[PDB]
């Protein structure tokens, strides 16, 4: 790794600097280097890792959709297809990189619910981004890989976290979107979002003002989707 010679703490520091500078490719490379030091990640470090790659893959997804839309109109020279493929391959590469970090060896060393659910949710997310661009004979297996990861994360979160836990809430949000538009299960999506929202509502009374803010922010995203879906 090109980050093999840099101190773990320096990589984390520079990831935070890169975030401030909106240099998310750099941020992701720094956090990949930190992961490859082999130590477990703290909560803050997990969030740095996720924010970095979410920003990188988000740009790729938005670009892919623009090209995927222009390509569909053109259908209903080879250049549109070629360039959509180029972006698609880059996007798949980022997803494979993240999945590789989770498999070697973040998930297997994650024993606390807050770390293990976080990583399994990420695994679901990056298989979902692969599913968004998948068209071949592996699309069903990619979708089932996303489903499996989300389901394991859900099972742990329901046993080990309160219904307002923001990790649990964000997992349920993303799994519901998976259902709606990847699994073509809109009713499952709506059910999951509603049940998640209502069970969180009923647990808000236990929270401090700060935790209340964190939980209600994600609850509003569930509501946003339910409003579009119903």
């Amino acid at each position: 790794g090109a980050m093999g010679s840099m101190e773990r703490a320096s990589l984390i520091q520079k990831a935070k600097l890169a975030e401030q500078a909106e240099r998310y490719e750099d941020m992701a490379a720094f956090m990949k280097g930190a992961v490859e030091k082999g130590e477990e990640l703290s909560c803050e470090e997990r969030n740095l890792l996720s924010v970095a790659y979410k920003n990188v893959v988000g740009g790729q997804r938005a670009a892919w959709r623009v090209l995927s839309s222009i390509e569909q109109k053109s259908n209903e020279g080879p250049e549109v297809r070629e360039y959509r493929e180029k972006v698609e391959t880059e996007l798949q590469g980022v997803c494979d990189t993240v999945l590789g970090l989770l498999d070697s060896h973040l998930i297997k060393e994650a024993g606390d619910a807050e770390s293990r659910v976080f990583y399994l949710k990420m695994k679901g997310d990056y298989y979902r981004y692969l599913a968004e661009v998948a068209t071949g004979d592996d699309k069903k297996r990619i979708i089932d890989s996303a489903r499996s990861a989300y389901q394991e994360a859900m099972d742990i979160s329901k046993k080990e976290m309160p219904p307002t836990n923001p990790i649990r809430l964000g997992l349920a949000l993303n799994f519901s979107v998976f259902h709606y538009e990847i699994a073509n299960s809109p009713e499952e999506a709506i059910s999951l979002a509603k049940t998640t929202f209502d069970e969180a509502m009923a647990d808000l009374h236990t929270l401090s003002e700060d935790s209340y803010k964190d939980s209600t922010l994600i609850m509003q995203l569930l509501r946003d989707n339910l409003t579009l879906w119903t």
């Binding site: 893959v57 988000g58 740009g59 997804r61 959709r65 997310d125 964000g170 949000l173 995203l221 989707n225």
Partner: peptide, 12 residues
């Protein structure tokens, strides 16, 4: 495409 809300940075 209409994108639904998911967790974290709305980076796309």
């Amino acid at each position: 495409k209409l994108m639904f809300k998911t967790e974290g940075p709305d980076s796309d």
